[PDB]
Amino acid sequence: KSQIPRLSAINDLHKIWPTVEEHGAAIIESFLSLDIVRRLNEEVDPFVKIEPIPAAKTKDHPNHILSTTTRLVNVLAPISKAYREDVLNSKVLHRICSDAFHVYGDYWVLMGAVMELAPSNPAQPLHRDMRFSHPIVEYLKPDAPATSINFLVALSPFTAENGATHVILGSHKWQNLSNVSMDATVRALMNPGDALLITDSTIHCGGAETTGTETRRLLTITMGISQLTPLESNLAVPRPVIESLTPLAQRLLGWASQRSAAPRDIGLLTIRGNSIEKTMNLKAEQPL
Amino acid sequence: KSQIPRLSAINDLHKIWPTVEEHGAAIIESFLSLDIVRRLNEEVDPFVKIEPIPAAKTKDHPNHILSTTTRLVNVLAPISKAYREDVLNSKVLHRICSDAFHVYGDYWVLMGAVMELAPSNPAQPLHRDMRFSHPIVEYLKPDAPATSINFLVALSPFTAENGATHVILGSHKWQNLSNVSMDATVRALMNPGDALLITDSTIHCGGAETTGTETRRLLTITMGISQLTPLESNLAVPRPVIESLTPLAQRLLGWASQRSAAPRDIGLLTIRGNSIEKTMNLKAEQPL
Ligand SMILES: CN1C(=O)c2ccccc2NC(=O)[C@@H]1Cc1ccccc1
Ligand SMILES: CN1C(=O)c2ccccc2NC(=O)[C@@H]1Cc1ccccc1
Ligand SMILES: O=C(O)CCC(=O)C(=O)O
Ligand SMILES: O=C(O)CCC(=O)C(=O)O
Ligand code: NI
Ligand code: NI
């Protein structure tokens, strides 16, 4: 069976989205630099350590899906300078997203999360994303362009033995799922900073951690059209932090109005014909 | 041709959504009381008067669709006590919305707007709503349940001569639009407080104002699944105003997290497994 196509973030940029469109997955080598990965890891470290189980009794929105050996931390903008500056303004991310979502219009972050899998974490069942938050997606026609995509960025090594992600190539075009099996999968073997890019229709799963010693970490960035509601809110992020961001990063976090691709677009999150940012006196790129 | 079915808000409540599901439209008689209509009108009056043309050069999100004789005012919560208290907590509205959207989960306000049409306002072209903001909707399968609905509430009389809304009954099920004509329409003749309820697939239009003297006004409430982004933002509404509202009204305006209907729903607009309202210390029902 054919492996996941691998591409350069530096040279093959225009080829990334067409590759995913065809195969349902691609590995973007050095999507983030080792320096960005280092700072990201340092900044999120304590928040991963304090995170309780996904379905903790203290939560009003528990995640009953994820294993007890998974820790997921979202709303990263207030935690991580590297995320809010470097990741949210990534030239590579934005080229891919504009390639993917031009039919629909503006896109934003549905969820940016660090996931850490403890040693001996079991394999997830094969799945498509978005089914526990956006039931609407299952009612889209088969030829509808993908309305979200997921960048799974390695923040530590992804190996066969430590639970590297499985994907089924071509499964983004599957209508009948009688042939879903781990037999049909290939692995996303990745170094820190590499990214596995999949669509919301790509069948995939986290792999089994089999060493009992290694802790695998990733940054999952689900980017989606601004017509779909994010999984996470940035409504409680302090205004000083938001005002430190670029206008583009503000838009990605829902601190700006949005536009569809319709010729005479009337807009999303508008206030009597004016934008959020105009109405609220919203500054940008103001150092903290 | 058969007229738009008319129903009581008081007696026929359970029949309203099934009627719209079958015919694509229904008139809800006395949806709002004359007292609510009176207060609504009084409170929005000055904001309608100051509203510039839909595509005013001062706007960064101009509406190039609506006629120059249309005035539309959205984000009504800060303007109108009657809207934020009586309309947003309407028992009738909430029964209909929960009937309509149970397959998907929580619903919220995509836009609540007062529209005032000046004398001699021309008929709008026949259309479906949502095509200038949510291109995603056109890619839904034909049998997908409606993802938004629109309550067109008369705030003044709707007559044949003053431009009462036209609808084509059954047009919510049309795939081929070769037979779209004003010949196929019937009128929503309504007294103040009556509501025309349509789906996002119902073909309809504003009528021609032919008297040259009458000013027609309506309250349009587009309710949609919480998975779709609103046309309007309440992000700039003062916290005292938001904290005066019921928890249900807060949710409708995007000042709460949301849930899908998936068995083990993971939620929308969540903050690390917790809701907006829990995270932000959000009070409710605090008098202004
Ligand atoms: C449930 N679930 C998440 O929580 C998740 C986590 C990170 C990024 C995306 C994301 N979206 C999802 O739909 C997944 C789906 C899933 C996960 C494990 C096992 C079965 C299904
Ligand atoms: C453009 N447009 C609005 O502005 C509008 C106004 C009030 C409530 C819903 C709404 N949504 C829409 O999609 C309509 C569509 C339309 C209007 C006039 C002529 C052709 C098409
Ligand atoms: O652990 C992984 O590599 C995949 C995680 C995933 O697909 C998910 O949680 O949705
Ligand atoms: O004017 C009316 O009654 C209908 C208005 C309408 O359909 C619209 O603006 O979308
Ligand atoms: Ni997944
Ligand atoms: Ni309309």
Query: Whose CA is closest to A133, among A49, A222, A16, A212?
Result: A222
Beta bridge partners of A140: B140
**Which CATH number covers residue B110?**
2.60.120.620
Distances (CA, A) of A243 to A37, A43, A247, A256, B238: 24, 20, 9, 12, 19
Residues belonging to the binding site of A for Fe cation are: 127, 129, 204
Experimentally, the structure was elucidated by X-ray
Instruction: Determine whether the shortest distance from the Cβ of B127 to ligand 2 is under 6 A.
Output: yes
The pair of three-digit structure tokens given for residue A16, joined into one six-digit string: 């990334």
Task: Say yes or no: B56 contacts chain A, CB-CB below 8 A.
Answer: yes
The residue whose two tokens read 């509205």 is B93
Cα–Cα distance measured from residue B157 to residue B151, given in angstroms and rounded to the nearest whole number: 16
Partner B contacted by A27 (CB < 8 A)? no
Which of A145, A79, A60 minimizes the C-alpha distance to B266?
A60
Query: B264 and A65 in contact by Cβ < 8 A?
Result: yes
Closest chain B C-alpha to A132 CA, distance in angstroms: 5
CA A14 to chain centre: 20
Amino acid at the residue A99: D
A156-195 burial, b if ≥16 CB within 10 A, otherwise e?
bebbeebbbbbbbbebbebeeeeebeeebbbbbbbebbbb
Q: Exposed, middle or buried, B43 (CB in 10 Å: 0-12/13-18/19+)? A: middle
B120: left (phi over 0), alpha (psi -120 to 50) or beta: left
Residue in this structure with the two tokens 């009528």, named with its chain if needed: B207
Output the residue whose Cα is nearest ligand 2's atom 13.
B129
CB proximity A3 to B under 8 Å: no
Q: Is B141 left (phi over 0), alpha (psi -120 to 50) or beta?
A: beta
Q: What is the DSSP string of A91-142?
A: HHHHHHHHHHHTTTB-EEEEEEEEEEE-TTPPPPPPB-TTTTT-GGGGGB-T
Both tokens assigned to A116: 């850490």
Is the C-beta atom of B220 inside 6 A of ligand 2?
A: yes
Distance in angstroms (rounded) separating the CA atoms of residues A163 and A208: 4
d(CA A242, CA A288): 10
* Cβ of B126 below 6 Å from ligand 2: no
List Cβ neighbours of B157 (8 Å cut-off, separation of 6 or more).
B190, B191, B192, B214, B216
- Quick check: helix, strand or coil at residue A277? helix
| Tokens (6 digits) for B165 | 């809304």
- Does the CB of B268 have a partner CB in chain A at under 8 Å? yes
Q: Tokens 């029949």 belong to which residue?
A: B15
Contacts of A51 (CB under 8 A, 6+ apart): A71, A72, A73, B272
**Would the CB of B150 count as within 6 Å of ligand 4?**
no
Instruction: At B145, list the tokens.
Output: 């349940």
Number of domains into which chain B is organized: 1
Backbone CA torsion sign across A137, A139, A142, A144: negative
Pairing of β B107-117 and β B70-73: antiparallel
Q: List all residues whose CB is within 6 A of at least one atom of ligand 3.
A: A 124, 129, 152, 165, 204, 206, 218
Q: Which residue of A has its CA nearest to B63?
A: A266
Q: Which residues of A135-149 are buried (b: 16+ CB within 10 A; e: fewer)?
A: bbbebbeeebebbbb
* 60-89 of B, contacting A, C-beta below 8 A: 60-65, 73-75
Task: Give the resolution value in Å.
Answer: 1.6
Compute the radius of gyration of chain A from its Cα atoms.
19
Domain that holds residue B200: 1-288
Contacts of B173 (CB under 8 A, 6+ apart): B24, B142, B201
Which ligand lies nearest the alpha carbon of B270?
Answer: 1
